């Protein structure tokens, strides 16, 4: 070859072989630089004030505060009364000493409004329910007794994974340890490192003995902005203060909920969920600080959408017939090199599978459903709404006084009540060595809805064919995927997995936790089926297998499927020798009597529908 021409910038002749095949520049002067930094900061400081417009606690504000002590030898009443002592107001504690659990505390020192909520200690779900509504959780600790091993830490971890807002840790029992301050500091740092293990953001747990540090807590609740939770703030939520039932029909009426609205915003056409009550539809809303009613675009209350109708070794038993049990199977060879269809006809498939929504992509409609509720919301978050809801009559025996137990109201998005087959992420809880199957009834709290479920366990390894292997038992180490039918959640809200048992102090046996992954019907879970047999007799080329079958018709029909062994040797059958399952076969190598003759054959599973849980 020839030595090439060389230049740093390409020659004009060479550009002709290549090419043939405005805003002027600015040099920033100081005043333009000084003005731009002023304009961006002034826009920033308006952003901070307007985002803080929710909490000028004189008329239009309510910070929801829940005192959650962790020790049975710890009363939230004295924790509350120590903090209110630093507001220089004694009459406020007198009015609430008799019997109150919901407090509308107005603070004149810091010009703030607090809503104080104390949950009931006898119910673990009630403690879980009162805390997700709040914007602040105050964890009361002990200086005298250690935290409960199976009760106290379980409260922290249950709140840890379902979503939690900002937090402050306090101590009220520090007087019980020795009075020398060198001893009070030695136990205080022990709790400081203990709370840092659970909640790493705060490296100081507060002592309520010092009135400045008692004010340090009291200021921080009123002043510092609450950290937001994505799933709660994407659907809106209402805390009730007054509930009144009216009569309009012999079987149902209207509840008059007088409460404040926070979150994203509410619409007259959308549904609603009340915890441990169910899902209902809207009737009328009213604004006090216009009137909006549910028009003809109501979402109907039905669990199945009616408009979707138009769109591993197993020992064989001699009495059990190998023909009837093995008709819905396919004889593929590789899990990653096979094909399946989602619309196959099967008696084991549910009849209501045709009545199921076939959602295309999750994240696109998840992004779509947020911006619709942003603009189509009537009740703006940060207002007072008189809420008129539709309500069946026979549930009035369960609703209690809202001033003693919390009564939340949760907004819903589009097509929440309609089902779609979904898959959940699942990680095993700490110190849980009990193995569970893939059909046990499990109660799951995801988002706000609580449902009974028996999902199908699987592995989360990626596959081009979207087919995965089934596990009979839950995998003890890594994350698993549980696929089932449930009402869809468009917020990717976290999920917690448990089962009730009255043996514990709580009626909860925590199994694990996880996240709402997807509403996926393309993902199909398959199971490998192995039936075993003992090779009875051996010849130079013919092997006789015993306890593989028990009828001669089973041998003849199963001739096409290629034969293999667990040692990794393939082969084929030759003829049926006996009636009780003795048959001839041929193999590439010579196998002994400790080897097992096995088959590889595959099927489908169809999961079971969900049911809401109460009690």
């Amino acid at each position: 070859g020839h030595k090439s021409y060389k230049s740093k910038h390409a020659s004009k002749g060479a550009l002709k072989r290549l090419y043939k095949g405005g805003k002027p520049d600015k040099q920033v002067s100081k005043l333009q630089r000084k003005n731009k930094a002023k304009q961006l900061r002034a826009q920033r400081i308006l952003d901070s004030i307007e985002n803080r417009k929710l909490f000028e606690g004189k008329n239009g504000a309510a910070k929801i505060i829940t005192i959650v002590p962790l020790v049975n030898d710890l009363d939230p009443l004295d924790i509350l009364y120590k903090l209110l002592k630093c507001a220089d107001d004694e009459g406020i504690m007198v009015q609430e000493v008799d019997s109150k659990r919901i407090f509308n505390v107005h603070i004149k020192k810091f010009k703030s409004n607090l809503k104080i909520i104390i949950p009931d200690m006898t119910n673990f779900l009630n403690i879980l329910d009162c805390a997700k509504v709040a914007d602040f959780v105050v964890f009361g600790l002990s200086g005298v007794q250690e935290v409960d091993e199976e009760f106290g830490e379980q409260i922290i971890r249950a709140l840890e994974l379902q979503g939690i807002a900002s937090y402050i840790g306090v101590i009220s029992n520090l007087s019980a340890v020795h009075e020398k301050e060198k001893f009070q500091l030695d136990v205080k740092q022990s709790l400081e490192s203990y709370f840092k293990h659970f909640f790493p953001s705060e490296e100081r747990v507060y002592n309520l003995e010092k009135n400045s540090d008692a004010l340090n807590v009291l200021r921080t609740l009123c002043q510092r902005l609450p950290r937001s939770i994505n799933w709660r703030d994407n659907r809106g939520y209402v805390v009730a203060d007054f509930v009144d039932f009216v009569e309009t029909s012999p079987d149902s009426g209207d509840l008059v909920i007088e409460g404040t609205v926070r979150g994203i915003g509410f619409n007259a056409n959308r549904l609603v969920h009340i915890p441990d009550f169910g899902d209902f539809q809207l009737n009328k809303i009213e604004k006090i600080s216009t009137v909006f009613e549910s028009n003809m675009n109501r979402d109907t209350l039905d669990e199945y959408a009616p408009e979707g109708t138009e769109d591993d070794e197993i020992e064989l038993e001699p009495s059990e017939s190998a023909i009837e049990r093995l008709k819905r199977y396919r004889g593929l060879k590789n899990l990653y090199n096979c094909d399946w269809q989602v619309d196959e006809k099967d008696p084991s498939s549910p009849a209501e599978w045709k009545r199921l929504l076939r959602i295309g992509n999750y994240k696109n409609t998840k992004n779509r459903i947020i911006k619709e509720t942003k603009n189509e919301a009537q009740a703006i978050a940060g207002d007072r709404i008189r809420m008129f809801i539709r309500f069946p009559k026979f549930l009035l025996e369960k609703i209690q006084d809202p001033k003693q137990l919390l009564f939340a109201v949760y907004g819903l998005l589009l097509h929440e009540h309609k089902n779609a087959v979904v898959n959940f992420s699942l990680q095993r809880w700490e110190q849980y060595d009990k193995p569970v199957p893939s059909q046990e009834p499990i109660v799951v709290q995801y988002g706000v809805r609580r449902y009974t479920i028996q999902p199908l366990f699987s592995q989360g390894s990626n596959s081009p064919n979207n087919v995965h292997k089934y596990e009979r038992f839950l995998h003890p180490d890594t994350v698993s995927v549980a696929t089932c039918i449930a009402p869809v959640d468009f917020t990717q809200s976290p999920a917690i997995f448990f089962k009730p048992s009255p043996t514990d102090a709580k009626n909860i046996e925590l199994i694990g936790h996880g996240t709402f992954l997807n509403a996926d019907h393309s993902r199909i879970l398959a199971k490998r089926a192995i039936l075993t047999g003992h090779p009875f007799r051996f010849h130079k080329t013919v092997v006789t297998v015993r306890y593989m079958f028990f009828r001669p018709e089973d041998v003849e029909w199963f001739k096409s499927i290629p034969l293999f062994t667990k040692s990794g040797r393939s082969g084929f059958i030759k003829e049926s020798l006996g009636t009780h399952g003795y048959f001839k076969a041929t193999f590439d190598g010579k196998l002994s009597a400790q080897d097992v003759v096995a088959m590889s054959l595959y099927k489908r599973m169809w999961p079971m529908p969900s049911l809401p849980w109460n009690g």
């Binding site: 030695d186 022990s190 659970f198």
Partner: protein, 47 residues
């Protein structure tokens, strides 16, 4: 796994630490060298 609330007030016995650990290296490295192959290997497997 979790730290105890009141904690702050196979198994092989522990190596010495600090000055006494350097005594272990000086004995191990070169006084009475254990394995000799002519090039003074330092970490063999199954010989």
């Amino acid at each position: 796994k979790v730290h105890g609330s009141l904690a702050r007030a196979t198994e092989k016995p522990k190596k010495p630490k600090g000055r006494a650990y350097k005594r272990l290296l000086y004995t191990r490295r070169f006084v009475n060298v254990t394995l000799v192959n002519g090039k003074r290997r330092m970490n063999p497997g199954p010989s």
